[PDB]
Amino acid sequence: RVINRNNRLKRLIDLGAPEIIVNNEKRMLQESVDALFDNGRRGRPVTGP
Amino acid sequence: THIWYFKGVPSRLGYLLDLAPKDLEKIIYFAAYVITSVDEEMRHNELSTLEAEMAVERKAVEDQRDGELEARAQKLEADLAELEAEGAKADARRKVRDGGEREMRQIRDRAQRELDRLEDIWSTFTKLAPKQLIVDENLYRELVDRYGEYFTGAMGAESIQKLIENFDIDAEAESLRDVIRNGKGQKKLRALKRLK
Amino acid sequence: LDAQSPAADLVRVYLNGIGKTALLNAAGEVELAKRIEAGLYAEHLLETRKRLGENRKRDLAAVVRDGEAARRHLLEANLRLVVSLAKRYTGRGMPLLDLIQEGNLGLIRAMEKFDYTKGFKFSTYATWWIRQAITRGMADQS
């Protein structure tokens, strides 16, 4: 889950994306890493099926 | 940012930076801008000229609005005189007058709101300090296009890194120590906690 | 300060961030497509023919600024419909907050290949790409 979004950001940086979408994706990546280090620490925890 | 050092209460990042946990949550997830540095001496010297420019802008917008309103008042008076000449209904004349008054109040209040924005920009610029916030993005972009060469604003963990690399630990520690020297208990407890 | 926020919404936060943007009329796409195409031709000429005229320099800079503003000023309204397009494919175990980013990726991919002043409709043209992009992304987890 982390690596998908990191690669998407790497792809969006060099395509000259507008500021809003890259800001959103950076927020998403930060949330993903935070889930990686400790799940359930904030808001709705990530859960599998 | 590492999750542990900003979420687990007491959030040591907040204690280090003297920021409310809500503020840190906002700034981390890209919901507000914060100031990284300000060239205080440059803005202090340029305050006079910048005040001159702000006053010029204010008087320009005020003159334009006053002239436009005067023209509208003259045309409205001409319309009312024509209504008197045409011998129409007096109540219809009062309806026209009330509509014109509504238009005038609307336009004058629009100019008042715009000058409110204009002065709010100056008020925000005057007391700019590091570790502040600007939630309203319109306000922030206006500050950018006005004085980008006079302040530095950022958002997200990059701002946190910039703040950290501009930290003089020893000076802040000794300032906290001397605050501890005085007996102000309510401030003393906070000083002790941040010192810890 | 021991402060906390509910933080029960994130997508709502994003849509709040972009919700103040107005919608566009039926033929509002060409108004900016012409500007961006003229800007592209102007910048190609600048990279080919240079130092010809001092007034031409400021004119070409102005038209390039117009093209950039156009590129920024035709994207905002489409998010209010990309969210709806994504919502049609929710509940399949993948967060719609994930769907929206690839939806925007398809959006830019379609916008950059809109047309050459050819008569068409912007919204359906965008959807033609957005649906396939988001469905491809959803299938990619398999």
Side-chain angles (χ1 to χ4, degrees), chain B residues 46-57 122:
Chain B
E46 194 67 18
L47 186 70
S48 58
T49 312
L50 295 180
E51 180 54 86
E53 272 93 57
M54 188 56 56
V56 166
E57 169 71 12
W122 182 256

mmCIF file with all atom_site columns, all heavy atoms in Angstrom, chain B residues 46-57 122:
data_model
loop_
_atom_site.group_PDB
_atom_site.id
_atom_site.type_symbol
_atom_site.label_atom_id
_atom_site.label_alt_id
_atom_site.label_comp_id
_atom_site.label_asym_id
_atom_site.label_entity_id
_atom_site.label_seq_id
_atom_site.pdbx_PDB_ins_code
_atom_site.Cartn_x
_atom_site.Cartn_y
_atom_site.Cartn_z
_atom_site.occupancy
_atom_site.B_iso_or_equiv
_atom_site.pdbx_formal_charge
_atom_site.auth_seq_id
_atom_site.auth_comp_id
_atom_site.auth_asym_id
_atom_site.auth_atom_id
_atom_site.pdbx_PDB_model_num
ATOM 1   N N   . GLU B 1 46  ? 11.000 48.714 5.539  1.00 0.00 ? 46  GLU B N   1
ATOM 2   C CA  . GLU B 1 46  ? 10.110 48.967 4.413  1.00 0.00 ? 46  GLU B CA  1
ATOM 3   C C   . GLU B 1 46  ? 8.685  49.295 4.839  1.00 0.00 ? 46  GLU B C   1
ATOM 4   O O   . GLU B 1 46  ? 7.846  49.567 3.972  1.00 0.00 ? 46  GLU B O   1
ATOM 5   C CB  . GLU B 1 46  ? 10.105 47.751 3.481  1.00 0.00 ? 46  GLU B CB  1
ATOM 6   C CG  . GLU B 1 46  ? 9.497  47.977 2.104  1.00 0.00 ? 46  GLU B CG  1
ATOM 7   C CD  . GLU B 1 46  ? 10.307 48.925 1.251  1.00 0.00 ? 46  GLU B CD  1
ATOM 8   O OE1 . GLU B 1 46  ? 11.491 49.154 1.571  1.00 0.00 ? 46  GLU B OE1 1
ATOM 9   O OE2 . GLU B 1 46  ? 9.759  49.440 0.253  1.00 0.00 ? 46  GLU B OE2 1
ATOM 10  N N   . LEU B 1 47  ? 8.394  49.246 6.140  1.00 0.00 ? 47  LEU B N   1
ATOM 11  C CA  . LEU B 1 47  ? 7.038  49.501 6.613  1.00 0.00 ? 47  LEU B CA  1
ATOM 12  C C   . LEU B 1 47  ? 6.514  50.854 6.148  1.00 0.00 ? 47  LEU B C   1
ATOM 13  O O   . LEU B 1 47  ? 5.341  50.973 5.783  1.00 0.00 ? 47  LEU B O   1
ATOM 14  C CB  . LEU B 1 47  ? 6.992  49.416 8.136  1.00 0.00 ? 47  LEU B CB  1
ATOM 15  C CG  . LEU B 1 47  ? 5.588  49.530 8.726  1.00 0.00 ? 47  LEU B CG  1
ATOM 16  C CD1 . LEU B 1 47  ? 4.788  48.282 8.409  1.00 0.00 ? 47  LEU B CD1 1
ATOM 17  C CD2 . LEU B 1 47  ? 5.648  49.774 10.221 1.00 0.00 ? 47  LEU B CD2 1
ATOM 18  N N   . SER B 1 48  ? 7.357  51.886 6.164  1.00 0.00 ? 48  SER B N   1
ATOM 19  C CA  . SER B 1 48  ? 6.896  53.218 5.779  1.00 0.00 ? 48  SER B CA  1
ATOM 20  C C   . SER B 1 48  ? 6.425  53.239 4.331  1.00 0.00 ? 48  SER B C   1
ATOM 21  O O   . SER B 1 48  ? 5.305  53.671 4.031  1.00 0.00 ? 48  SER B O   1
ATOM 22  C CB  . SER B 1 48  ? 8.016  54.235 5.990  1.00 0.00 ? 48  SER B CB  1
ATOM 23  O OG  . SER B 1 48  ? 9.167  53.883 5.242  1.00 0.00 ? 48  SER B OG  1
ATOM 24  N N   . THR B 1 49  ? 7.267  52.755 3.419  1.00 0.00 ? 49  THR B N   1
ATOM 25  C CA  . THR B 1 49  ? 6.903  52.750 2.008  1.00 0.00 ? 49  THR B CA  1
ATOM 26  C C   . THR B 1 49  ? 5.699  51.856 1.754  1.00 0.00 ? 49  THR B C   1
ATOM 27  O O   . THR B 1 49  ? 4.827  52.195 0.946  1.00 0.00 ? 49  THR B O   1
ATOM 28  C CB  . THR B 1 49  ? 8.090  52.297 1.167  1.00 0.00 ? 49  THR B CB  1
ATOM 29  O OG1 . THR B 1 49  ? 9.261  53.010 1.576  1.00 0.00 ? 49  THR B OG1 1
ATOM 30  C CG2 . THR B 1 49  ? 7.830  52.569 -0.299 1.00 0.00 ? 49  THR B CG2 1
ATOM 31  N N   . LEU B 1 50  ? 5.639  50.705 2.425  1.00 0.00 ? 50  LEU B N   1
ATOM 32  C CA  . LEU B 1 50  ? 4.510  49.803 2.224  1.00 0.00 ? 50  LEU B CA  1
ATOM 33  C C   . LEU B 1 50  ? 3.217  50.427 2.724  1.00 0.00 ? 50  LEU B C   1
ATOM 34  O O   . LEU B 1 50  ? 2.159  50.262 2.108  1.00 0.00 ? 50  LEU B O   1
ATOM 35  C CB  . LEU B 1 50  ? 4.781  48.469 2.912  1.00 0.00 ? 50  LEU B CB  1
ATOM 36  C CG  . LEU B 1 50  ? 5.958  47.720 2.288  1.00 0.00 ? 50  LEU B CG  1
ATOM 37  C CD1 . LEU B 1 50  ? 6.209  46.404 2.995  1.00 0.00 ? 50  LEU B CD1 1
ATOM 38  C CD2 . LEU B 1 50  ? 5.732  47.503 0.800  1.00 0.00 ? 50  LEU B CD2 1
ATOM 39  N N   . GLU B 1 51  ? 3.284  51.155 3.838  1.00 0.00 ? 51  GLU B N   1
ATOM 40  C CA  . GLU B 1 51  ? 2.125  51.903 4.299  1.00 0.00 ? 51  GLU B CA  1
ATOM 41  C C   . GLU B 1 51  ? 1.724  52.946 3.275  1.00 0.00 ? 51  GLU B C   1
ATOM 42  O O   . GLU B 1 51  ? 0.532  53.164 3.032  1.00 0.00 ? 51  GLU B O   1
ATOM 43  C CB  . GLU B 1 51  ? 2.431  52.559 5.643  1.00 0.00 ? 51  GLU B CB  1
ATOM 44  C CG  . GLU B 1 51  ? 1.282  53.360 6.215  1.00 0.00 ? 51  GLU B CG  1
ATOM 45  C CD  . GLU B 1 51  ? 0.009  52.548 6.323  1.00 0.00 ? 51  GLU B CD  1
ATOM 46  O OE1 . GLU B 1 51  ? -0.164 51.850 7.344  1.00 0.00 ? 51  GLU B OE1 1
ATOM 47  O OE2 . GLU B 1 51  ? -0.815 52.599 5.386  1.00 0.00 ? 51  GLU B OE2 1
ATOM 48  N N   . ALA B 1 52  ? 2.709  53.601 2.661  1.00 0.00 ? 52  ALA B N   1
ATOM 49  C CA  . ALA B 1 52  ? 2.406  54.580 1.624  1.00 0.00 ? 52  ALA B CA  1
ATOM 50  C C   . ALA B 1 52  ? 1.664  53.927 0.463  1.00 0.00 ? 52  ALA B C   1
ATOM 51  O O   . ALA B 1 52  ? 0.666  54.462 -0.034 1.00 0.00 ? 52  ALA B O   1
ATOM 52  C CB  . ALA B 1 52  ? 3.694  55.243 1.138  1.00 0.00 ? 52  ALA B CB  1
ATOM 53  N N   . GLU B 1 53  ? 2.138  52.760 0.028  1.00 0.00 ? 53  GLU B N   1
ATOM 54  C CA  . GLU B 1 53  ? 1.490  52.061 -1.079 1.00 0.00 ? 53  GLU B CA  1
ATOM 55  C C   . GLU B 1 53  ? 0.084  51.612 -0.706 1.00 0.00 ? 53  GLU B C   1
ATOM 56  O O   . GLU B 1 53  ? -0.843 51.706 -1.520 1.00 0.00 ? 53  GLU B O   1
ATOM 57  C CB  . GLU B 1 53  ? 2.333  50.866 -1.517 1.00 0.00 ? 53  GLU B CB  1
ATOM 58  C CG  . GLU B 1 53  ? 3.373  51.197 -2.572 1.00 0.00 ? 53  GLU B CG  1
ATOM 59  C CD  . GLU B 1 53  ? 4.722  51.534 -1.983 1.00 0.00 ? 53  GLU B CD  1
ATOM 60  O OE1 . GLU B 1 53  ? 5.276  50.694 -1.247 1.00 0.00 ? 53  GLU B OE1 1
ATOM 61  O OE2 . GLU B 1 53  ? 5.229  52.639 -2.256 1.00 0.00 ? 53  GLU B OE2 1
ATOM 62  N N   . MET B 1 54  ? -0.090 51.109 0.516  1.00 0.00 ? 54  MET B N   1
ATOM 63  C CA  . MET B 1 54  ? -1.413 50.687 0.958  1.00 0.00 ? 54  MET B CA  1
ATOM 64  C C   . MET B 1 54  ? -2.374 51.866 1.009  1.00 0.00 ? 54  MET B C   1
ATOM 65  O O   . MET B 1 54  ? -3.536 51.751 0.602  1.00 0.00 ? 54  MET B O   1
ATOM 66  C CB  . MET B 1 54  ? -1.316 50.011 2.324  1.00 0.00 ? 54  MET B CB  1
ATOM 67  C CG  . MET B 1 54  ? -2.605 49.370 2.792  1.00 0.00 ? 54  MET B CG  1
ATOM 68  S SD  . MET B 1 54  ? -3.235 48.164 1.612  1.00 0.00 ? 54  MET B SD  1
ATOM 69  C CE  . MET B 1 54  ? -1.831 47.067 1.448  1.00 0.00 ? 54  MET B CE  1
ATOM 70  N N   . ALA B 1 55  ? -1.903 53.011 1.500  1.00 0.00 ? 55  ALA B N   1
ATOM 71  C CA  . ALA B 1 55  ? -2.737 54.205 1.527  1.00 0.00 ? 55  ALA B CA  1
ATOM 72  C C   . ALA B 1 55  ? -3.083 54.667 0.120  1.00 0.00 ? 55  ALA B C   1
ATOM 73  O O   . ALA B 1 55  ? -4.206 55.116 -0.131 1.00 0.00 ? 55  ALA B O   1
ATOM 74  C CB  . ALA B 1 55  ? -2.032 55.319 2.299  1.00 0.00 ? 55  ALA B CB  1
ATOM 75  N N   . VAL B 1 56  ? -2.128 54.581 -0.808 1.00 0.00 ? 56  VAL B N   1
ATOM 76  C CA  . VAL B 1 56  ? -2.404 54.952 -2.193 1.00 0.00 ? 56  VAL B CA  1
ATOM 77  C C   . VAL B 1 56  ? -3.491 54.056 -2.769 1.00 0.00 ? 56  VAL B C   1
ATOM 78  O O   . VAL B 1 56  ? -4.434 54.525 -3.418 1.00 0.00 ? 56  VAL B O   1
ATOM 79  C CB  . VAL B 1 56  ? -1.118 54.889 -3.036 1.00 0.00 ? 56  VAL B CB  1
ATOM 80  C CG1 . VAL B 1 56  ? -1.453 54.929 -4.517 1.00 0.00 ? 56  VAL B CG1 1
ATOM 81  C CG2 . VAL B 1 56  ? -0.187 56.032 -2.669 1.00 0.00 ? 56  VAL B CG2 1
ATOM 82  N N   . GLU B 1 57  ? -3.381 52.750 -2.529 1.00 0.00 ? 57  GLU B N   1
ATOM 83  C CA  . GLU B 1 57  ? -4.405 51.827 -3.001 1.00 0.00 ? 57  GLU B CA  1
ATOM 84  C C   . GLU B 1 57  ? -5.761 52.148 -2.385 1.00 0.00 ? 57  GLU B C   1
ATOM 85  O O   . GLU B 1 57  ? -6.788 52.154 -3.080 1.00 0.00 ? 57  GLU B O   1
ATOM 86  C CB  . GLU B 1 57  ? -3.988 50.391 -2.683 1.00 0.00 ? 57  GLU B CB  1
ATOM 87  C CG  . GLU B 1 57  ? -5.076 49.354 -2.886 1.00 0.00 ? 57  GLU B CG  1
ATOM 88  C CD  . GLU B 1 57  ? -5.405 49.106 -4.344 1.00 0.00 ? 57  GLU B CD  1
ATOM 89  O OE1 . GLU B 1 57  ? -4.641 49.561 -5.220 1.00 0.00 ? 57  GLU B OE1 1
ATOM 90  O OE2 . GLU B 1 57  ? -6.430 48.448 -4.615 1.00 0.00 ? 57  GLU B OE2 1
ATOM 91  N N   . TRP B 1 122 ? -3.155 44.139 5.322  1.00 0.00 ? 122 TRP B N   1
ATOM 92  C CA  . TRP B 1 122 ? -2.130 44.911 6.014  1.00 0.00 ? 122 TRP B CA  1
ATOM 93  C C   . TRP B 1 122 ? -2.008 44.488 7.469  1.00 0.00 ? 122 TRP B C   1
ATOM 94  O O   . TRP B 1 122 ? -0.898 44.377 8.001  1.00 0.00 ? 122 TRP B O   1
ATOM 95  C CB  . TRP B 1 122 ? -2.448 46.398 5.919  1.00 0.00 ? 122 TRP B CB  1
ATOM 96  C CG  . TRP B 1 122 ? -1.427 47.249 6.568  1.00 0.00 ? 122 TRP B CG  1
ATOM 97  C CD1 . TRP B 1 122 ? -1.525 47.873 7.774  1.00 0.00 ? 122 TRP B CD1 1
ATOM 98  C CD2 . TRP B 1 122 ? -0.133 47.567 6.055  1.00 0.00 ? 122 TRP B CD2 1
ATOM 99  N NE1 . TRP B 1 122 ? -0.373 48.571 8.040  1.00 0.00 ? 122 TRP B NE1 1
ATOM 100 C CE2 . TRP B 1 122 ? 0.498  48.395 7.000  1.00 0.00 ? 122 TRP B CE2 1
ATOM 101 C CE3 . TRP B 1 122 ? 0.553  47.234 4.886  1.00 0.00 ? 122 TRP B CE3 1
ATOM 102 C CZ2 . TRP B 1 122 ? 1.778  48.895 6.812  1.00 0.00 ? 122 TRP B CZ2 1
ATOM 103 C CZ3 . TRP B 1 122 ? 1.823  47.732 4.701  1.00 0.00 ? 122 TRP B CZ3 1
ATOM 104 C CH2 . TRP B 1 122 ? 2.424  48.551 5.659  1.00 0.00 ? 122 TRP B CH2 1
#
